Design a protein around this nucleic acid. Structure first.
Ligand code: ATP
Ligand code: UTP
Ligand code: MG
Ligand code: MG
Lengths: 501, 1208
RNA sequence: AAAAAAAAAAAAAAAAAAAAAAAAAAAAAAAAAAAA
RNA sequence: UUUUUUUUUUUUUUUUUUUUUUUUUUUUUUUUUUUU
RNA sequence: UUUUUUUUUUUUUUUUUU
């Protein structure tokens, strides 16, 4: 007895790769589960949506030890109807409750099942990477089982003992399903259709998997391809499933491409992005602003310019984008001018990569004051000396946030945000959570995550590197993961799901 | 025409000629505006300019009335005072004036085109100037000013004193008042457009200054300095100047307390009792004296020169401690206004709620165990202030993990969710999917959960709550800024419920919190009074300026780590929509992904800490919608009180452990914390305690807090209560008799006089002269809240006027023959203030037949039926005990006019502001909502109760739905629905039902005599035996431990005779409290008790099921059985006196303590309950007549009817 | 959109103290009180 | 010795409402209503 | 050879305080 009724809702389990055996006691059990779902949906909707006595329904369904028979009375009629319907099954033990461990599965569970969870030990099925495992008892009995065809395993079904009504087929041979279907006697069987690809990359610490929301025909890679080739579609759509620090880097080749299920975005990330879009479209709000944090090296500007272009073309209004280090590159030039230019185009003109930052110069002096110039000199130091140097850098990060003065940072973001020629919807990146009291006032702020090992990418920059790595360490030591964690495909999907005009 | 020539004004005794005179003149004031304008602005007042006399300590002071130019001749409206940004989204960032700048009234013109930004701004400034200044607690502001002026006149018997000249020079602009307030269109309509804009607030300012005069804080001379200082502060912006120099005009007392050198103070014990007095030096230590230079230069450069010369007068001319106490009280009354501080939300939103960053930053702890979304599960600090706090709280994790397990948290959620509050606003589809009446009463937090209770176990609602914003809500408070607190809906509160429950548990394990121990009397400051008496002590009163604006995200992570550790050691399944299961998880060091069994609450705390948004949102009528900057604390959550307490005690105790581990001692003994306010106490040498104080200050600056660090040898401040060397210095200038935060009419005048009594009772042990306060309260009950309107049916106008004018004066108005339902405004007599179910105010002496007067009732007098004793006191009670009568002498009572008050108090005219709250609320719908609401926590408790209630219905007699635990939530939602439909009518509805009962009761109307008022009639006779005093009367002679307990004062003498309070000397409780009332905190007039005792009179076979219908536990079951058994035996006598605990602040609570002062004959003891009853009699009389005794023993007589009532 | 009309109206969390619980009448009985 | 009212107390029963604006009435958001 | 204890219901309004 599953949470979501498979006889009613077949397509959702078809998406997971689970097909129904055609028409034994399992068939009777699954039909009795369908009748129990229908009866519960009748009784619960007759009230506001709450069951009358949820532990009684839970015990009658799960345990089968309770028989309610009345020979007020009107308050128990809903229980007596359920009691006759359970008595007329004659099971030796009651039906169990089955839940998958996936978020997309739990968002579709009806409310009465959620009420019945709290008074019943469910049978929770864990998932590997979003797909429920197939060695479990209930799935092996009810649904038909997959079969994996590879470049070695490929043969006729008569070489095995495969049957149509018990075995389903999943290929990853790279050949087309029509070719394998009409060339190998696989016409009678049924195939699993997946849409994502799961790529295991070679990294320094070991092999690294990667889940990609695109398809294998779209994301055109083959076995032995570089990491920089098709880097941007991977950045837009990929997610590393391993523990940080993962070892993905610019030297990474691949090992195998396997089809896999798509990913589903979280509820909280779509909620925060939808609240931002509600702030964009409304005329009650004057200034709309998003704040996006990332570790120094995650590659956020090359995505957020594309995000701004998507939002601009989809909403029609002009989105202005402030960079991550606009304040440092502005303070490098105007630390001595009494009254500087707070205009928007003058700030965005000084935003290129040739313009050095103020914090990078001060951290370079802080590194050279301890005789550190190389990465091999910095990594060789112990942790406590690094913490000492990071506190010496915190003593100069604190000096620009403490008060609202004409060279401060809170005044800078005030005068840029509330200008006359500034765009309406703005997007501002940050570096640490203390800067949120300084960056202009919002309702939404997120923390972005990409497919990058940030300490690995800073080892490979052609210029500097040591100051970049030291500032990365200071910034990672300054911000925790205390806001919502938002991947790039979540933002692109949140743009797509919002209806316009 | 003149109150100061009356015979009440010089004898202060209600004779028969005086009482009618005062009643007539107060009627003259309360009726029409013409008598008020002639009273306040008579031409007989000689306008004075120079005035000389004593200060608070008899030193001669000379002053001069001086009004600046900017109040009489205001500047024109400068539009640059409230500027805007260039995108015009908000005000200017750095702007000076958050409040009402003084300018000419008619200069504020809106000439712009409508639906434009400048038009919106000038309309909002108009709304600021007219609406946001009227804060009148009782009635019209001119009538409150008249009440204060009249109290001053009848007290001092003369009209020439400076405040009348201040009134005639500020407010006398022509023949009419410059402004009036209107209840219909709620604003202050000006009539002279050339008057200054701030000038309506000076009505309340003059009321507070006169309240300080009648209070005895400052004399007539110091009122000149106070009003000059206040008029100086309103030169540019009246509120900003008071907020700027608030700290500098109060932080001077430590220097004068140093300059008196040596004082003789009493010494307290551990166990709340005075031992003796000693003479300690009062010199501050060497490091404190380095601050006096900076404070002296700062008060020289910011302050006003008259106030500065007064502050230097107070420094130079003090000799004892009490000179400093009196001068501190005077400077409190000179610097505080008492008015609430209010403007538009958008102005004070920057300085109220904007997050700021101070000295150091706070860093992150390393993440040991991590969710698949990289949300942190288990984490730990390496080194820092988080390490310092967790090094103390990691000991406490393990016991709290055991305590959290034994709490069923869904029922705990419901019992917390009991509070009615808005939360969320509905959308349109639910208003059609749910009844429109349900959408009407959907303004409550319990009803909102009852509506959406079908998705309580669904995890999607938590992700759904993040889309909704957090609506801001403003608050006022006197002498502080407009604090803008946040207000959030159900699910934002639900995420912060488990951190509240986890951090709640720390109070049982560790004593250092002032939250669990509050009582309203001297048991609250036993700690401060004990520790200030000790030697080699260092008292540090550390405050954090800007508590919520300092707590950033990283500072909140310290509390997060403690909650996560306790939750990871906890084991609870099924908290909310969450449930215990196995989760894929990441760990540090491991490269792959592990699998651990995460329980429910730790999932809940992880999702709370991971998705933390603070930024509030106010929808302005000026700018559209204003967003707040992120990084504040939300401060509307459930855990908004325990967060600060746990954080601060973790920092302080961890600093103690760190100093111990670094080879240094810890001089700290005991601390108390409520949150923003911390008491610290050190003991040892000067060097060690100064080191430990500076180390705690340094660790607070390491945690990023701007700290206010006042520390001394002989002063402590916590909970707005200040103590200097075993002596409570109250703050009388903090609370205000003349302003309320919200404007509310009086629909029921008992609630007005109860508010008046509760406000006066807080001003007893913090005032210097309570007698003038009693007289001021009498006059603001006299003329301010006296007029009560009426609207009769037009046919029966003259009949009702011919009936009700025998007992009252009915101000007859013109009939309208054109339109029906005419009105007849009446005024109710002054005897109403002295009656139970009436005003309940203490009484002045009345004249009997003999000429002998009654006892002048003090401020410690009881309330309740002991106020009904006053009728028998007006009758000659010793003559009543003489010839064995019980006749009340209705001639004298009708002559004083009490029987009209009793007629009005019985016919319940004042009780009928709405007269009904009807049915057709569809209780089927309420029963369905509370059916779907029971299904959340503890299933099975209430169905049993309904079956027991049906059993008691079917065989015997029914119970009320009020009484049944199963019908409790039905009754809760029903009573929440009754408050959503509220109405207060401006007039009355005396239409033939009220008229028939008035015609029936307008008879001779003798006052009824309940046969149980025979306990009221008894008297005491003065012997010539002077009794001994308590020995602590000698020790509190030098420095009085309160303002009003000075040597020779009646509070001191009552404290001498009755003695101090104690919790262990409770000889009679079960015999005292029942004839007081309730048995064991269950009342006798409790429907629990009443229905149970009606069961107990009948057969007791229905009794166990009665308990099952209530569902009370077995211990309370045995208590209730004892209650019926003890009520059935000698439940005859009960006396019902109400005695406030704040009113009885240092005095004794146990009435047995007055048994050694009254000699009782042994032939009177005829029952098992006489010994408590007689002690109640003697205790109430010794507190009642404390202004008339001179220390002599009493004898008691009793009436034979009382003996027959007690016997029976 | 120019105009007219019924309704839904905005005030969080913790610690502590004090007060409050429809009306009218009929049937049985005692005290107070008027008449005889 | 009979009757008029208050109150300690028992039983039964009715169980239940109106508009009047003294007001110098406020603003925008939405469902519906009629002219243009 | 017997005699004594300190305690959590709800609704609304007010007060002190964070
Ligand atoms: N100087 C004044 N000038 C003009 N109108 C005034 C003035 N003072 C009060 N009022 C207004 O005149 C109205 C007359 O009210 P009215 O005399 O009918 O009953 P009221 O309630 O006794 O008046 P009040 O507001 O003084 O209590 C007041 O409601 C108020 O609106
Ligand atoms: O009604 C309230 C008031 C206050 N609080 C909470 O208690 C704290 C109030 O603490 P205080 O009132 O003692 O000082 P303050 O912070 O308000 O004023 P400044 O020190 O900034 O000068 C605040 O931090 C608030 O979170 C509430 O939760 N509710
Ligand atoms: Mg404080
Ligand atoms: Mg504070």
């Amino acid at each position: 007895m599953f949470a979501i009724d498979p006889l009613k809702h077949s397509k959702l389990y078809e998406e997971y790769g689970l097909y129904l055996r055609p028409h034994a006691p399992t068939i009777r059990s699954i039909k009795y589960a369908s009748l129990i779902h229908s009866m519960l949906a009748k009784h619960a909707a007759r009230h506001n949506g709450t069951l009358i006595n949820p532990r009684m329904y839970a015990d009658m369904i799960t345990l089968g030890n309770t028989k309610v028979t009345v020979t007020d009375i009107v308050t128990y009629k809903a229980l007596t109807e359920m009691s006759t319907l359970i008595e007329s099954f004659r099971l030796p033990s009651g039906l169990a409750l089955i839940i998958f461990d996936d978020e997309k599965y739990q968002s579709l569970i009806p409310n009465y099942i959620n009420q019945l969870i709290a008074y019943t030990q469910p049978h929770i099925i864990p998932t590997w990477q979003g797909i429920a495992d197939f060695s479990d008892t209930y799935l092996r009995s009810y649904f038909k089982r997959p079969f994996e065809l590879t470049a070695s395993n490929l043969a006729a079904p008569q070489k095995y003992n495969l049957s149509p009504m018990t075995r389903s087929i999943f290929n990853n041979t790279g050949r087309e399903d029509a070719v394998i279907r009409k060339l190998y006697g696989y016409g009678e069987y049924v195939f699993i259709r997946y849409e994502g690809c799961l790529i295991t990359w070679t990294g320094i610490y070991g092999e690294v998997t990667m889940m990609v929301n695109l398809s294998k025909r779209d994301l055109g890679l083959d076995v032995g391809d570089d990491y920089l080739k098709e880097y941007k579609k991977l950045l837009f759509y990929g997610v590393i499933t391993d523990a940080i620090p993962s070892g993905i880097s610019a030297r990474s080749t691949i090992m195998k491409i396997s089809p896999h299920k798509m990913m589903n975005p979280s509820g909280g990330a779509l909620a925060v992005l939808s609240k931002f879009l509600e702030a964009v479209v409304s005329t009650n709000v004057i200034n709309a602003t998003l704040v996006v944090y990332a570790e120094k090296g995650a590659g956020k500007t090359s995505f957020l310019s594309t995000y701004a272009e998507q939002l601009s073309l989809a909403s029609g209004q002009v989105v202005g984008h402030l960079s991550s280090d606009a304040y440092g590159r502005w303070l490098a030039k105007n630390k001595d001018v009494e009254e500087p230019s707070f205009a928007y185009d003058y700030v965005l003109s000084l935003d290129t990569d040739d313009n050095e930052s103020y914090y990078e110069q001060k951290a370079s002096e802080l590194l050279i004051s301890h005789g550190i110039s190389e990465v091999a000199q910095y990594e060789l130091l112990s942790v406590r000396k690094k913490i000492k140097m990071m506190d010496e850098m915190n003593e100069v990060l604190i000096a620009q946030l403490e008060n609202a003065d004409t060279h401060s940072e809170r005044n800078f973001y005030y005068m840029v945000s509330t200008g006359k020629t500034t765009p309406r919807t703005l997007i501002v990146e940050g570096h640490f959570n203390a800067q949120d009291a300084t960056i202009a006032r919002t309702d939404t702020t997120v923390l972005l995550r990409t497919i990058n090992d940030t300490t690995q990418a800073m080892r490979d920059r052609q210029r500097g590197g040591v100051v970049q790595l030291f500032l990365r360490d200071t910034y990672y030591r300054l911000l925790p993961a205390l806001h919502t964690t938002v991947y790039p495909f979540e933002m692109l999907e949140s743009i797509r799901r919002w209806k316009w005009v | 025409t003149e109150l100061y020539n009356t015979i009440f004004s010089e004898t202060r005794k209600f004779t028969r000629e005086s009482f009618k005179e005062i009643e007539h003149l107060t009627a003259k004031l309360a009726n029409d505006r013409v008598a008020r304008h002639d009273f306040l602005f008579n031409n007989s007042i000689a306008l004075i300019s120079d005035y000389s006399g004593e200060d608070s300590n008899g030193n001669q002071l000379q002053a001069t009335v001086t009004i600046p130019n900017e109040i009489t001749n205001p500047k024109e409206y400068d539009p640059s005072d409230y500027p805007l940004a260039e995108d015009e989204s908000f005000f200017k960032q750095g702007h000076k004036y958050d409040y009402l700048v003084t300018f000419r009234a008619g200069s504020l013109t809106n000439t712009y085109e409508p639906k434009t930004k400048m038009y919106k701004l000038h309309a909002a400034l108009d709304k600021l100037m007219h609406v946001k200044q009227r804060k009148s607690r009782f009635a019209d502001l001119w009538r409150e000013l008249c009440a204060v002026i009249a109290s001053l006149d009848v007290w001092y018997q003369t009209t020439n004193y400076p405040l009348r000249t201040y009134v005639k020079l500020l407010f006398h602009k022509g023949d009419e008042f410059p402004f009036y307030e209107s209840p219909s269109q709620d604003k202050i309509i000006f009539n002279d457009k050339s008057v200054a804009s701030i000038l309506p607030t000076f009505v309340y300012t003059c009321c507070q200054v006169g309240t300080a005069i009648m209070s005895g804080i400052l004399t007539h001379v110091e009122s000149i300095v106070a009003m000059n200082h206040f008029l100086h502060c309103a030169k540019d912006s009246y509120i900003d100047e008071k907020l700027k120099i608030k700290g500098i005009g109060r932080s001077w007392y430590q220097e004068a307390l140093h300059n008196v050198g040596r004082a003789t103070v009493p010494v307290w014990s551990q166990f709340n009792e005075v031992i003796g007095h000693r003479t300690k030096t009062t010199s501050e230590p060497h490091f404190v004296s380095s601050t006096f230079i900076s404070l002296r230069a700062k008060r020289a450069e910011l302050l006003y020169p008259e106030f500065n010369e007064y502050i230097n007068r107070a420094l130079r001319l003090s000799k004892t401690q009490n000179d400093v106490a009196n001068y501190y009280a005077a400077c409190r009354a000179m610097t505080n206004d008492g008015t609430f501080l209010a403007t538009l939300t958008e102005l004070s939103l920057d300085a109220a709620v904007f997050p700021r960053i101070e000295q150091r930053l706070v860093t992150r702890p390393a993440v040991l165990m991590s969710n698949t979304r990289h949300e942190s599960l288990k984490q730990k600090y390496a080194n820092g202030v988080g390490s310092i706090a967790q090094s103390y709280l990691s000991s406490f994790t393990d016991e709290i993990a055991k305590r959290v397990n034994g709490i069923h948290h869904d029922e705990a959620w419901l019992n917390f969710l009991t509070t009615s509050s808005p939360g969320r606003k509905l959308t349109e589809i639910e208003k059609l999917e749910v009844g429109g009446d349900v959408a009407a009463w959907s303004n409550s937090r319990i009803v909102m959960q009852a509506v959406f209770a079908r998705e309580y176990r669904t995890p999607e609602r938590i992700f759904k709550s993040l889309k909704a914003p957090i609506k801001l809500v403003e608050r006022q408070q006197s002498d502080r800024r407009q604090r803008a607190i946040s207000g959030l809906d159900n699910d934002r509160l639900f995420l912060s419920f488990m951190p509240y429950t986890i951090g709640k548990q720390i109070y049982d394990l560790n004593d250092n919190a002032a939250q669990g121990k509050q009582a309203g009397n001297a048991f609250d400051i036993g700690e401060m009074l004990y520790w200030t008496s000790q030697r080699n002590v260092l008292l540090s009163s550390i405050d954090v300026a800007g508590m919520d604006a300092s707590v950033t995200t990283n500072t909140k992570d310290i509390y997060n780590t403690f909650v996560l550790d306790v939750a990871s050691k906890c084991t609870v399944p099924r908290f909310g929509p969450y449930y215990a299961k196995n989760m894929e998880v990441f760990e540090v060091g491991k490269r792959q992904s592990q699998v651990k069994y995460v329980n429910a609450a730790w999932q809940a705390c992880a999702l709370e800490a991971a998705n933390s948004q603070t930024s509030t949102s106010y929808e302005s009528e000026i700018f559209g919608q204003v967003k707040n900057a992120e990084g504040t604390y939300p401060s509307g959550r459930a855990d908004t009180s325990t967060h600060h307490t746990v954080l601060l005690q973790g920092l302080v105790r961890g600093n103690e452990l760190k100093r111990a581990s670094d080879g240094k001692n810890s001089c700290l003994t005991t601390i108390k914390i409520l949150g923003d306010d911390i008491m610290e106490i050190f003991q040892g040498n000067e060097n060690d305690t100064h080191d430990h104080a500076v180390s705690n200050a340094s660790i607070l600056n390491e945690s990023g807090f701007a700290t206010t660090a006042e520390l001394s040898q002989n002063s402590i401040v916590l909970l707005q209560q200040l103590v200097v060397n075993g002596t409570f210095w109250g703050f009388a200038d903090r609370i205000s008799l003349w302003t309320r935060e919200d404007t509310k009419d009086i629909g029921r005048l008992n609630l007005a006089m109860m508010e008046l009594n509760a406000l006066i009772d807080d001003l007893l042990f913090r005032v210097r002269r309570p007698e003038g306060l009693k007289m001021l309260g009498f006059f603001c009950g006299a003329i301010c809240l006296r007029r009560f309107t009426l609207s009769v049916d037009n046919k029966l106008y003259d009949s009702t006027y011919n009936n009700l004018s025998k007992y009252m004066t009915l101000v007859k108005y013109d009939k309208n023959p054109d339109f029906d339902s005419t009105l007849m405004s009446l005024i109710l007599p002054l005897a109403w203030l002295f009656m139970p179910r009436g005003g309940e105010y203490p009484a002045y002496p009345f004249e009997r037949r003999d000429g002998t007067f009654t006892e002048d009732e003090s401020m410690f007098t009881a309330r309740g039926a002991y106020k009904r004793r006053l009728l028998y006191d007006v009758s000659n009670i010793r003559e009543m005990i003489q010839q064995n009568s019980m006749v009340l002498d209705d001639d004298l009572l009708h002559e004083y006019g009490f029987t009209g008050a009793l007629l009005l108090i019985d016919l319940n005219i004042l009780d009928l502001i709405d007269e009904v709250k009807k049915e057709d609320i569809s209780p089927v719908k309420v029963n369905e909502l509370a059916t779907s609401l029971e299904q959340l926590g503890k299933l099975g408790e209430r169905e049993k109760s309904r079956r027991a209630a049906s059993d008691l219905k079917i065989r015997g007699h029914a119970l009320s739905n009020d009484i049944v635990y199963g019908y409790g939530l039905q009754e809760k939602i029903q009573k929440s629905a009754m408050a959503t439909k509220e109405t207060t009518v401006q007039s009355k509805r005396v239409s033939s039902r009220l008229h028939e009962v008035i015609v029936a009761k307008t008879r001779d109307y003798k006052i009824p005599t309940m046969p149980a008022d025979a306990l009221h009639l008894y008297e005491f006779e003065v012997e010539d035996v002077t009794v001994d005093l308590l020995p602590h009367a000698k020790h509190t002679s030098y420095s009085n431990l309160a303002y009003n307990m000075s040597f020779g004062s009646d509070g001191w003498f009552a404290f001498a005779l009755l003695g101090g309070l104690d919790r262990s000397a409770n000889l009679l409780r079960l015999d005292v409290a029942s004839i007081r009332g309730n048995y064991h905190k269950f009342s006798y007039d409790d429907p629990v008790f009443k229905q149970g005792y009606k069961i107990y009179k009948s057969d007791a076979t229905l009794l166990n099921d009665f308990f099952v219908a209530i569902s009370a536990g077995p211990k309370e079951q045995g208590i209730l059985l004892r209650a019926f058994a003890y009520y059935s035996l000698y439940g005859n006598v009960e006396y019902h006196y109400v005695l406030s605990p704040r009113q009885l602040f240092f005095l004794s609570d146990n009435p047995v303590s007055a048994e050694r002062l009254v000699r009782i004959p042994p032939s009177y003891y005829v029952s098992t309950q006489c010994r408590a009853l007689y002690n109640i009699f003697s205790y109430l009389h010794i507190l009642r007549s404390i202004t008339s005794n001179q220390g002599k023993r009493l004898g008691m007589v009793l009436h034979p009817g009382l003996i027959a009532y007690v016997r029976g």
